[PDB]
Amino acid sequence: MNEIYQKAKHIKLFAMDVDGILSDGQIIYNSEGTETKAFYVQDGLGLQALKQSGIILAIITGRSSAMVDRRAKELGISHIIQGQDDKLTALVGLTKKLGIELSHCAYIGDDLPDLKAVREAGFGISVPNGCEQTRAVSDYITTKTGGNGAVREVCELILKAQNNFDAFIATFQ
Amino acid sequence: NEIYQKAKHIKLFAMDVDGILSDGQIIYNSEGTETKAFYVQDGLGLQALKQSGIILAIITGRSSAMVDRRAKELGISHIIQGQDDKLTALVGLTKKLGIELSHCAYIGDDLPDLKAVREAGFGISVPNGCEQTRAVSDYITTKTGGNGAVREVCELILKAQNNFDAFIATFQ
Amino acid sequence: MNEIYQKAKHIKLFAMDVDGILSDGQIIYNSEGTETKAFYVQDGLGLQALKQSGIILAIITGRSSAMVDRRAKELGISHIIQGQDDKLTALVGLTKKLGIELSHCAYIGDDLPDLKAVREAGFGISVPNGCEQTRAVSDYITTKTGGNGAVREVCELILKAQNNFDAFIATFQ
Amino acid sequence: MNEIYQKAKHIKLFAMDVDGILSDGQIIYNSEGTETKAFYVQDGLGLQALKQSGIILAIITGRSSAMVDRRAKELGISHIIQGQDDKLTALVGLTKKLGIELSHCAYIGDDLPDLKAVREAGFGISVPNGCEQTRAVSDYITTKTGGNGAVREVCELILKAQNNFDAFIATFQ
Ligand SMILES: [Mg+2]
Ligand SMILES: [Mg+2]
Ligand SMILES: [Mg+2]
Ligand SMILES: [Mg+2]
Numbered sequence: 001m002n003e004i005y006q007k008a009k010h011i012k013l014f015a016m017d018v019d020g021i022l023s024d025g026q027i028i029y030n031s032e033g034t035e036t037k038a039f040y041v042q043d044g045l046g047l048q049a050l051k052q053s054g055i056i057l058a059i060i061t062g063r064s065s066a067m068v069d070r071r072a073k074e075l076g077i078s079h080i081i082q083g084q085d086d087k088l089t090a091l092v093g094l095t096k097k098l099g100i101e102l103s104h105c106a107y108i109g110d111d112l113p114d115l116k117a118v119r120e121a122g123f124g125i126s127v128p129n130g131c132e133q134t135r136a137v138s139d140y141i142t143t144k145t146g147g148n149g150a151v152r153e154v155c156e157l158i159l160k161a162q163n164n165f166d167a168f169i170a171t172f173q
Numbered sequence: 174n175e176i177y178q179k180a181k182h183i184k185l186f187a188m189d190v191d192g193i194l195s196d197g198q199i200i201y202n203s204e205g206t207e208t209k210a211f212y213v214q215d216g217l218g219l220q221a222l223k224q225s226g227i228i229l230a231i232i233t234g235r236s237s238a239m240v241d242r243r244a245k246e247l248g249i250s251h252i253i254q255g256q257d258d259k260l261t262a263l264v265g266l267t268k269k270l271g272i273e274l275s276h277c278a279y280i281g282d283d284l285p286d287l288k289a290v291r292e293a294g295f296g297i298s299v300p301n302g303c304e305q306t307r308a309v310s311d312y313i314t315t316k317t318g319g320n321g322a323v324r325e326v327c328e329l330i331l332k333a334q335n336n337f338d339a340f341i342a343t344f345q
Numbered sequence: 346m347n348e349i350y351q352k353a354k355h356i357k358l359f360a361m362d363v364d365g366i367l368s369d370g371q372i373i374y375n376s377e378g379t380e381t382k383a384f385y386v387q388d389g390l391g392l393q394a395l396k397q398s399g400i401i402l403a404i405i406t407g408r409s410s411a412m413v414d415r416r417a418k419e420l421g422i423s424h425i426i427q428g429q430d431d432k433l434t435a436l437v438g439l440t441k442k443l444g445i446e447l448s449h450c451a452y453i454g455d456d457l458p459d460l461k462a463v464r465e466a467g468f469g470i471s472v473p474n475g476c477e478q479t480r481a482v483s484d485y486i487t488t489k490t491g492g493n494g495a496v497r498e499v500c501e502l503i504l505k506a507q508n509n510f511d512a513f514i515a516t517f518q
Numbered sequence: 519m520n521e522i523y524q525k526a527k528h529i530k531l532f533a534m535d536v537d538g539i540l541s542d543g544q545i546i547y548n549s550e551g552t553e554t555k556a557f558y559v560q561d562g563l564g565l566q567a568l569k570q571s572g573i574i575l576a577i578i579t580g581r582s583s584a585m586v587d588r589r590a591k592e593l594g595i596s597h598i599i600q601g602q603d604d605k606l607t608a609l610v611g612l613t614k615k616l617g618i619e620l621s622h623c624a625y626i627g628d629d630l631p632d633l634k635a636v637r638e639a640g641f642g643i644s645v646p647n648g649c650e651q652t653r654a655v656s657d658y659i660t661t662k663t664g665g666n667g668a669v670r671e672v673c674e675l676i677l678k679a680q681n682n683f684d685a686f687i688a689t690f691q
Contacts, residue, residue, distance in 0.1 A: 019559040026665075027562075029585040030554040034202050041197040042283055042303070067201040111560055115690040131560070133687055147198075169305060172284035208375040213364040214456060214476070216372075239374040319371075341478055344457040373548075381548040386537040387629055387649070389545075412547040492544075514651055517630035 007123040007139050008161035012104040014050055015058040015091055015117075016077075016151065018068055020110030020129055022059075024147030037067040040147050044075055046155030051076045053164040056098060060090045062113055087117040108154060109134060110146055125154055176312050179295045180333040184276040186222055187251075187263060187293075188323065190233040190240055192282030192301060196319035209239040212319050216247050218327030223248050225336045228270060232262045234285055259289035280326060281306060282318055297326055352468040352484055353506030357449040359395055360403035360424075360436060360462075361496065363413055365455030365474060367404075369492035382412040385492050391500030392420045398509040401443070405435045407458055433461035453499060454479060455491055470499050522658050525641045526679035530622040532568060533576035533597075533609060533639075534669065536586055538628030538647060540577075542665030555585040558665050564673030565593045571682045574616065578608050580631055606634035626672060627652065628664055643672055 019025055022043065028036035051057055058079040059072055065082070072080050081090045091105055107114070107121035110130035118124035119137045126138040127150045135141055140157070142150040159165040191197050194215065200208035223229060230251035231244055237254075244252045253262050259281065267274055275294035279286075282302035290296035291309040298310040299318045307313060312329070314322040331337040364370055367388065373381035396402055403424040404417055410427070417425045429435045436450060452459070452466035455475040463469035464482040471483040472495050480486055485502070487495040504510035537543050540561065546554035569575055576597040577590055583600070590598045599608045605627065613620050624641035625632075628648035636642035637655040644656035645668045653659060658675070660668040677683040 025559045027557045027559055027589075028554060029557070029588055031552050031584050033584065033588070034204055034552075036200060036202045036208070036554070038198045038200045041191040041199050044199075045283060045285075066203045066205070070201050070205075071199075111563060112687070112690040113563075119691075133690070169284070172287045172305070206376050206379075208373065208381075210371045210373050213370045213372055217456060217458075238376050238378065242374055242378070243372075341457070344460045344478070379548050379550055381546060381554070383544045383546045386543040386545050390629060390631075411549050411551075415547050415551075416545075514630070517633050517651070 004123075004140050004157075005161040008106070008158045010104060011055065011106040011123055011158055011162075012100050013056045013058060013094065013098065014106045014108075014154075014158065015060055015079075015094070015121075017087070017109040017111075017114050018059060018061040019063065020146040021108055021127060021150060022071070022147065024145065025110075025129065035065060035067070037065065038147060039071055040149055040152075042149050043151040043155075046152035047075050047077065049159060049168045050155050053159060053162065053168065055158065058091075058094055060084055060087050060117070085113055087114050088120060091117050091121065106154075106158060108151070123158075176329070177333045179311050180278065180330050182276050183227060183278045183295055183330055183334075184272045185228040185230060185266070185270060186278040186280075186327075186330065187230040187232055187266065188279070189259070189281040189283075189286050190231060191235060192318045193280055193299065193322060194231075194243070194319065196317065197282070197301065198319075207237060207239070209237060210319060211243050212321060212324070214321055215323040215327075218324035219247050219249070221340050222327050222330060224340075225331065225334060227330070230266060232256055232259050232279075232289075257285045259286055260292055263289050263293065278326075278330065280314075280323070295330075349485060349502075350506045353451070353503045355449055356400060356451045356468055356503055356507075358401050358403060358440070358443065358445055359451045359500075359503065360405055360439070360453075360466075362432070362452075362454040362456075362459050363404060363406040363410075364408065365472065365491040366453055366495060367416070367492065369490065370455070370474065371492075380410065380412070382410060383492060384416050385494060385496070387494055388496040388500075389420055391497035392422070394504060394509075394513050395500050396421055398504060398507060398513075400503070403439060405429055405432050405452075405462070407432075430458065431461075432459055433465055436462050436466065451499075451503065453495070468503075522641075522675070523679045525657050526624065526676050528622050529573065529624045529641055529676055529680075530618050531574045531576060531612070531616070532565075532624045532626075532673075532676065533578055533612070533635075534625070535605070535627035535629075535632050536577060536579035537581060538664045539626055539645065540589070540665065540669060542663065543628065543647065545581075553583060553585075555583060556665060557589055558667060558669070560667050561669040561673075562593050564670035565595070567686050568673050568676060569594045571677065571680065571686075573676070576609075576612060578602060578605050578625075578635070603631045605632050606638055609635050609639070624672075624676065626669070641676075 057077040060081045062085050084090045103122035105121045106123040107117045108125035115134050124138045125140045126135045127142050127146050129145050142153050144150045229249045232253040234257040256262050277293045278295040279289045279293035280297035287306050296310045297312050298307045299314050299322050301317050314325045316322050316325045402422045405426045426435050448467035450466045451468040452462045453470040454463050460479050469483040470485045471480045472487050472491050474490050489495050575595045578599045580603045602608050621640035623639045625635045625639040626643040633652040642656045643658045644653045645660045645664045660671045662668045662671045
């Protein structure tokens with residue numbers, strides 16, 4: 001632990017990849033030209049509690065979709081960078097816009113495009129379903145899988161390492 | 174006998190939706206539609222609980238036509254949507270049905286479900302559920318949510334009430 | 346173990362439950378009131394093969410749906426019985442219509458309403474995902490699960506029992 | 519795990535089955551006549567990397583749908599054959615239309631229609647969800663299942679055999 005917690009303690013921004021992280025990775029099409037994407041419910045409460053404890057939420061995704069716009073809005077995710085292959089540059093751009101540093105950003109991804117941003121963020125996360133190279137470069141690997149609570153699990157970890165986890169639990173107790 | 178005694182006197186069984194009746198997936202498409210999946214074997218269990226005289230209810234923080242439909246075809250008379258404070262709703266039910274909290278079962282999977290699982294006469298959770306709800310529950314299912322969790326529990330309550338073998342005999 | 350083949354060798358009618366057998370048990374709804382159901386692709390080739398060796402196929406379900414009609418018609422399943430509580434009566438009513446005895450009927454099912462039909466058919470089949478009572482009265486239980494190959498495997502098993510499997514494989518070699 | 523690298527060394531075309539390879543083999547229908555098919559995100563980045571290494575791509579499937587077109591175009595798959603059960607016929611047709619030896623063709627599939635093309639290609643591949651006959655005929659079985667990164671797995675494998683794996687990764691480091 002130790003190193004993980006200090007990295008997580010100084011986080012002001014959590015920035016997410018969509019496919020493989022917020023969803024399990026299925027790109028779903030149908031015979032009328034419609035697209036579908038699945039998200040996990042427990043991820044929703046975790047993100048909410050990070051917003052309310054003071055952390056700014058962001059999405060950086062290489063694909064563009066309405067489903068992502070619809071989920072981000074309802075979740076209180078504030079910055080939505082769609083159609084962006086270069087994750088680092090978007091993350092650096094938010095850092096200058098919000099007036100923080102890479103060291104104050106947490107980043108979670110699952111594939112090669114995320115690699116630099118996971119490497120250069122203060123706290124870089126990946127998932128079991130994530131590829132070999134991106135996992136080698138991360139400060140933490142989740143126990144749960146993309147679209148099955150990987151985000152929630154890291155939400156609770158940042159909350160713990162900020163001694164904010166009990167405030168959150170107690171509102172339901 | 175710990176679990177069987179708590180369940181022996183259930184007069185109403187009430188349920189969370191997402192994570193319980195579904196595997197907790199929330200599905201959206203590019204034309205503004207939402208989708209939810211349920212498990213067939215749950216329906217049979219729930220219907221069997223109905224027939225023995227147990228009242229059924231749903232209490233969920235989200236809101237959808239899918240939940241109305243499933244509940245209608247399953248004889249679920251109390252459908253409470255857009256409601257995150259599960260314990261107030263359940264107590265609201267308890268009183269207006271003329272029953273007690275000790276005669277209530279409630280199954281749930283996340284923190285909004287905590288207090289209701291704690292205060293319900295028979296509190297239930299699931300493997301996929303979080304640790305704080307689970308620590309507070311009288312029983313945990315082997316099968317996951319949207320995978321027989323509810324059916325398992327339905328069978329549990331019937332056995333407790335001397336009603337399982339007779340339900341089985343209807344299909345023999 | 347080998348009592349299994351004598352049962353399988355005189356099958357002229359293979360009748361299937363739908364949910365838990367042709368599907369994994371997911372009943373799917375949406376906000377426009379639509380319903381959806383998933384089928385396994387490999388089950389097709391196996392029902393195609395049983396139909397070719399001269400076996401007549403049937404579906405008995407306590408549930409409606411045009412999805413059943415669509416899948417059934419693409420596999421050439423002639424007899425489709427939907428909205429049926431009592432499967433055993435449906436099955437028997439179907440044997441009288443044909444020149445068939447219960448002994449020449451195979452039937453596969455996952456839950457209690459399938460119990461009598463699985464028990465009285467000459468070759469009753471169930472699945473790892475079926476309830477306990479239905480499994481304890483079947484003559485065979487599949488390795489693969491509903492909507493994941495249960496049907497294909499039992500299709501292969503009957504073909505082997507009727508000396509039609511080896512000829513069937515060969516056509517793809 | 520050594521015979522595989524030489525077989526793959528000379529591949530100038532990777533051709534693919536759809537159902538059971540690019541998807542998990544679910545065939546999805548709803549009550550408005552709409553068919554749905556699911557794909558895997560990490561496969562795309564695998565395919566475009568191959569295509570960028572100078573390898574032509576192809577699909578050969580027994581079914582027909584708008585989804586396969588939408589996905590194939592999206593991933594730069596130029597040769598798309600639909601409504602064809604003779605996979606070995608179609609592939610040969612492609613090999614001679616493009617002027618390439620069959621020893622240079624890699625082909626992946628899950629079931630019996632695929633078995634001849636798998637066996638006769640310079641690099642035939644199957645997956646764990648696939649049948650026994652087609653598995654026993656393949657040069658390589660994937661660890662990852664159809665619709666869950668099987669295509670991505672082989673994609674990287676071909677790159678490693680061709681000495682383009684390192685250059686592919688560098689672009690994200
Ligand atoms: Mg991703
Ligand atoms: Mg829930
Ligand atoms: Mg069934
Ligand atoms: Mg196939």
